[model samples]
Target: VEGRFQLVAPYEPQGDQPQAIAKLVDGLRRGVKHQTLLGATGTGKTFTISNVIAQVNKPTLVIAHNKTLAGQLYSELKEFFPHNAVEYFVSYYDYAQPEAYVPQTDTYIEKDAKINDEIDKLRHSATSALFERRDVIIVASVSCIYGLGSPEEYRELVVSLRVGMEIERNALLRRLVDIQYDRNDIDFRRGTFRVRGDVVEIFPASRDEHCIRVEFFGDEIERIREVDALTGEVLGEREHVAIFPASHFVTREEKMRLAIQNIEQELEERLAELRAQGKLLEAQRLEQRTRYDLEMMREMGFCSGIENYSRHLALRPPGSTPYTLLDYFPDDFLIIVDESHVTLPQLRGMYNGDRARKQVLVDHGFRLPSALDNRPLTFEEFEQKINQIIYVSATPGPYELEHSPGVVEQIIRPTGLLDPTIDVRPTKGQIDDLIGEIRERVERNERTLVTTLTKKMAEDLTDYLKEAGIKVAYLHSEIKTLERIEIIRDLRLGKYDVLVGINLLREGLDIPEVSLVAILDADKEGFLRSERSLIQTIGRAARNANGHVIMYADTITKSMEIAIQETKRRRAIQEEYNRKHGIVPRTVKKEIRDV
Candidate 1:
């Protein structure tokens, strides 16, 4: 089967896009281990990626740094590949509180979790399509690097159908149950099966709005139908359909037994090691925990912290790498790392954070050393697994810069939007100048964004702006997630004339109503004012047709110079593109109610 989907765009490639797209496709064809797309904001990065995928005709995985960006990419890709398989794979847990123990305070918190069925279905659909079809694009968050079941085990558990196979209906139902499919006659939902007389209808886990109706006549299989779960109408008939496991963490009875055995052996060795180290209290605590966990596992086929036994369940040797989402892909799959500057560090830091936490657990006798095995893949592990990697970032980090000899500069904007023009002034009169700028923008029914060096500065500036009869609010890391979204929405809707923030005003932020982005204390010469940081902050204004930036500074610093130079280069290219294409930049207005 071939994936011959057409892109539904009316526009053609112009300006630097043709060159950038050519180079990217060429690098992919040449099988470069690492490639970088240095695309500035408003450069149609997603469009370019979609075109590349269309040309290469390879299954792709786009990894985003956070949930919001992942959702953005997911929607964009779905639009680009309307007929093809475009899936979102993120953590299914709406809220997850991992089991933790604090020996210092003698506190133990039980595991608490709430699963989102919609997300879980999407995850299964991603894996199922990856294994069963060729045209697939999975847009995922950093959760993709986390542990999952081995692909081989998952594939082996699938029940394949044939025309002449003499499989009994009861035997098929039993196999489904063994693979974790629940028998729900009343509900007949996804990941569940229902039996009526001699016929059995098994709903696979990978479906959101549909179900598979398998008709079994006596001891012989009669037919298979794809039906709409809501209306119970048969959409089509199929010769054969593979029914995958109902859960990603499925294991056979033998594997569960072996895992129990391994758990006992590890417990014995750990207890002896702790006793030898003269930690009797730690040893005793660990013994009780392990004993309870083992009993639970034997009785119920599962236990808390069951992920720690992933190595055993996967049937891999000690210290062997467990399965990750990467293992679900074909060897020739392509990987796209979105926002490599921030995401690369986040990916590299997961293992350390998890290891540090597990180390404490092991030292205090809360968990076994093998608990460390249940973790996100280390950077090296990810590197070793992936064949071709394309790093997409407006500000490429040192890693991507070092890996790719020369970055592919995409400074031109398809929308004719220039990089916000930046101005530097003395910090002594910064507040006064900012107040005046805010007044000018507010008079024109426009908004202003001010960035401070710290949360304290942001709050103080907000208070000062309020005293000056300006409607302003401060945003920082301390703001809750939903509230932050609301704040941005309100700011865009003109509920506030100016918004002050620190690091939260960068990346994945779109506010076309805001015409000015003011950077306070620009010459502070810290991480917040670094070239990458400034570029990202400046990007916030790019959504506006008449976007501009102002930097309150005392002296011209190295970071400021770099940022200004890069901004100028990008703006010049954007101007040339606008002139050549005869396109005028317009403010992009999205439907707020729909959002």
Candidate 2:
């Protein structure tokens, strides 16, 4: 429960994994601030990372920009460290519409969010694990950069109970109430406690169906046992247990009183400033909302949308950075940013959009200027928080390359698979030529992926291909998450022979049945046709044994040329290794059970 990271794996490090893991562990020991793991698709990057974590023997945080990718990493790490604490941290909201004000339309939308119960519990479990264990691996999303309650308070406010400890029964119940655990004897649920004569049963926020029963004799604790809430079955007994707060946003009674005073003072000052500018309507709106919120806090100890006043609640001055999940980490910890080319930009972009939206609310008097303080950390703040970091990406971005001394490459896949061969063709009659290519793959019982420049183009191409008597479908940003998974599954199950899309086929879409990738208008260089984008889309076909790519471009652009050249460079290495080891390239068989 408290020890080094013990990696439990059935297979040893393969291909370039051993060396890559060795160099990474060595760099961390040397106190390297920034490192890069240039690992290609199907190269077992997570496996190599598990080895590095075992050698380094420190807690690790792996961040992925995409929620799906984060889920994948969490599952893999959970399997790799079955005995250790492998936790998940991501946004718990199923849907969210932040408070916004539109001046031109005179419209105001209040904040609305629906939290997912299971994910919220998992998030609590993640933070609790970080506080209690040393061998913890947390797979998180960019949401980790957003504001969280101060770790100082989170740790200080925990309720520690021990068997046979001298404590009055009423005193113990009061402590639980202070930590936000409600007294509900009838409907016993999470974050609630029930009393029956001499025994008290409490359900923790980070658990489900398991309640802790604290038996008391007179004024002293007698015993503690975990019981099944539904069956009344004793699961286990413990000498001592630490109970975390019912919510992440916890405040002491004194802090709550001080915060109410601070919020009141801020509201008065802002009202005067608005009146002086002859904005009477704006001033009135601000006063009504602030006064209502203050009344709720004074009476009920909290209010809706209380997060907007986090600056006052934390007792921090304006413009100071808010505490985040990164603050929960120890001084010495490891950070692995998966797909840094995507995640780094996401981290940098969060602050600006959040600021712009909150600023509009402030300017219209829908919110106080302090509301702007509740935001994701700036890119510089994120950088300053890093103790040591490894950026993992197949196509390392400019920022990663500039900061890292040198990248550790893992291009040779363990399956002896090579990067797909790329070919450029004339644009004249490109659709007819692409149809022919699709037909060839269809006859071979393989799948084809086609990329376009726009969503409309993807749909149009899908229609054209369908009219030509070929099973086809199109996917874009408009498609929901579950539907996207279905589309990818259909492609692999032979439900669709050719799938058309724009930019959605890039990262994390692996189908061993895909043998051909077609990129339309590869010469029109832009965001979707950048070097990294091109390489990622082309990597989709690398999972297949007979993978090939065709770029329908009359003139070869810089991005196309570089993507093709890099594929060739990696293929040569793979071919040489296969020949030397007498390995034959074969398509990896995958199950379509969940598709």
Candidate 3:
């Protein structure tokens, strides 16, 4: 929390990056609570933010909207801060299906999802770095606001083993278990500890295949070393080692006792309410389940989906906000919200969908009403935590516009790429016109993006393009996430020259080779043709020197007109900067970074 930020990158900040960085640095120094970094699609927003962090010299938390973007931020931060701690955090799950119960069939489904351990390990590393190092940049999702273990409690539980520090072996083993570590002498693995003679070996969950060995002599610590798990080779000696807890939802035995008591009290009140309404079936179901859960918790200290009891486990007052990773950061830490238009709006409603499901459970005696308290930070709570926030987006949203005095625009790309030119034509024979546009880009070994209104149109257009002898594919929500990755890669690798998609290809679908984007019905103004959506689709092709947009519409809708004027606005600014710097925009520049 006290270390100065050091930005180390291969290339210098170019174009308007200097001005944006300086302006942002001024805001940070002036202690501005809210700011905006409105960079264009091709502009290096991440790199620019790195410069701002360096100038301000503070710990920063970068909240992304998705895991893919979070991973990308982690990689770029690693490149920029090679010497500093660049930590990545995401939900432990790579794929998941929440536990559900159907009252109609009286079906209770227990779904065990296999999560990504590497991402889980990275989250542990992120939080550990926040407490241990000063020069840290944590790239996280909305998970930053999800329920988590108490930071100070975890710090207290961390078993700091130092050479020559007197400690009883039995007492140390007990403390480890208190923090959720298992004693497994037979088959040692992460989150487990083993004892052999005078030495104790622990495989910390944060580590993949490495472990720490503590050698005790006469109940006194003799030596400490990190060892290779496979060959038991001593990697190195250490003066001190801080071991993190095994799970994020850690609790003490006393807390568990209090939680069980609280659950019992709530269950009694709920049962009385149900019985008073003469709903005997609901009352019986509630009593049976609640008593069974309490029995399990009392005996084994755990129950599946025990997070419902988190309001009690965490000992938070009724309706208190759940603890989150945000609580771990120091007061002066900076927050950078990427793609504010989408990410912040998405974040503002982080638990909106989850609440719908929880109500279904609570209404039918599936869970306690208090279970609703275990949720992401509310929008107001999210704002209260961050000292300063810089909203970064190509299209700033209402909240960002109203929150900040004025947005700092980074319209000029570092590589001197200009905003794409907009062209409007008739919707009639639009597919035929699109085929010609696709061929023109194909002849130049470039790529084209076609955005349709619906999935059926996108898929049908793919067939029509193929009939016209064009190499093309369609991507939509129906496509698997991994399959979509392959489709995009194939387009970049010249396997296909055209990609027809709906909204999936708009933001974060950066393809440096894409030279054209077609709007099938631009004048059909709706969700797909809104001002924000139009600008985003237009921004997609601006990476290429010849990047252009073709809006096939019968009438010039308000959205289309505003999109064209915005593109022109950015183009003029970019062109003027290029002329002033004696720089001529070229055919293209490298933008291979992708989804």
Candidate 4:
């Protein structure tokens, strides 16, 4: 299948983009195991990736660790693949408070969640496209690693129809029930099926915009059609069609039976172990709970905390990995890890955190040992499943650096923007220096970004800058998402001449008007002053042609040296590109839409 998709804008490959695009395409065609796109800020990394996707014509999965960034990427990719399949996959729960139990404090918290209907529909659309087409790109979060139903079972339970097929209405209804679709006559909601006389209408779990209309004549079905759920208008008639399960976590009757048996076995083994260890109360508590769960499962084919039985449901042996979204992709599917410096760590961290919580629940009798099997894939598991990978980052982490044989550099912005020039000075009179610099930028009608070590420092600097009559605001994790969008927009609109932040101001942030980026406590070598952090902070100013970074430090640190060296290396390449193309670096005056 070819992805000869049309990009919305007349996007021209500028600066080192032509080189970056050529190298990435060459490497992918040669089946490179791991390719790194070392694209700095303002370099149009997304555009580069989109071009690569178009060239390769492979179904792609772009993973982002943050929701805001995921949303941004989704919008960008949608524009690129306007007529192709571009989908967003994230946690649909608007509010998710997982049920947790703490035996030490004797506390049990019930799971409370609210579904975001729009997001839910999008997720369904993503999966539907994945199964239906070859040209697709799913921008997802780390939530993809969580337990979802096996794709095999999901596909198997789908209802198939033809223009003339002999089928019983009751048999069709049974199949829907097997896939966990509820029978609802009054509500007629998505994931619910309703029967009125000989006609059956099923709203799939994965969609809300349309419902399947199966018109039956006696025991043999007559016709099948798709209709608008709200308007009830016939959209189309099909000779054959399939309807997937409403939920991803569906199990067959045999699997449910096996799951219950396995749960019993685990319960007995755990109870015996606890008794042998002289934990009588724990043993008794587990026994009672396991008995209750078993009864519930036997009667209803499911129980609360059913995900804990994923091992048996998935039919995997002890210590085996469960299926994840990665398993849904074809063996040769390409994986792009966006912002890999953060995303790589986030991926590796999921297992540990999930394991820690589940262990507590099992040890305290809140869950069975099988609960541990229901987890994100281990790093090795995730790696084993992926045939090829690409790490995309401005500042690639050690993992990517070590994994890739050689890094593919993409530092030159297509707009002829270079890496910000760095200047280091003594921290003793940093405030005074910053004020002077701020005065100069404001006079030029330019904006600035300031990075502090902590939230407190960002606020204090904002206060001092404000007192000095410099328009400013401090942003941190505490800032709400919508407000953060507004703040960035305001800064670009010149509502504030300077913005101070801790770590949230880096990555996926574009402000072409910002000319200066001030780094306070640059000598402090920690998370905020690490090589990646410094590179990310410096990138904030890269949008402007004359972008510059000032580090207020009494002594240069290791991170400072690495950051400076990397920046200079990238700058030399960018300058060379400008000279070769007979171009001069100029400030970009384009306005970015509100994120």
Which candidate ranks first by TM-score, i.e. highest?
2
lDDT of each: 0.83, 0.88, 0.83, 0.81
Clashing pairs in 4: 149-248, 205-246
lDDT of 2: 0.88
lDDT agreement of model 1 with the native = 0.83
C-alpha TM-score for every candidate: 0.93, 0.96, 0.93, 0.93
Clashes of 3: 0
After superposing candidate 3 on the true structure, give the runs of residues whose Cα lies further than 4 Å from its correct spot: 1-3, 92-94, 102-111, 114-116, 480-486, 493-495, 504-508, 589-595
With a 3 Å backbone cut-off (N, CA, C), the pairs that clash in candidate 3 are: none
For candidate 1, report its TM-score: 0.93
Give model 3's TM-score versus the native structure: 0.93
Backbone atom clashes (below 3 Å) for every candidate: 0, 0, 0, 2
Q: Which window of ten consecutive residues has the lowest lDDT sum in model 1? A: 92-101
Candidate 2 C-alpha lDDT tens digits along 1-595: 4588778899999888889998999999999999999999989999998899989988889999877789889999989999999998987322467788888888888665566678778888889889987999999899899888888888999988888887888888998888878999988878799988888998888888878999887888988999999678999798988889977777898999999899988999999999999999989999999999999888867778877888888999999898999999999999999999989999999999989999988887888999999889999999999999999999999999999998999988888999999989998999999999999999999999899887787888889999999999888757777888888888888889988888844444788999999999898967988899899988988999999999988787889889989999999999998999888988899887573
Ranking by lDDT: 2, 3, 1, 4
The segments of candidate 1 whose C-alpha lies over 4 angstroms from its true place after superposition are: 92-95, 476-490, 504-508, 579-595
**For residues 67-134, what per-residue lDDT tens digits would candidate 3 score against the true structure?**
67887888999989888988888873335667567779987655567656687777888888887788
Report the error of model 4 at residue 457, Å: 3.3
Write the residue-wise lDDT of candidate 1 on 1-595 in tens digits: 5765466666777658788888889999988889999998777888888887788988889999877788889998888888889988988322465666776787877665656678888899999999988889999887888889889999988999965469987788889878878888888677888888765777888886678877765677787888887577888688888999877777888988998888889899999999999999999999988899889878867765577768777767777776889899999999999988998998899888878777888888888888777778989998899888889999999999999858887777656778888888888878998899889999989998888888788888999999999888778757787777788888878888898888744443577888999998888967888888988888888888889999988888888899899889888878877887788988877767425
Total clashes in model 2, counting residue pairs 3 or more apart in sequence or in different chains: 0
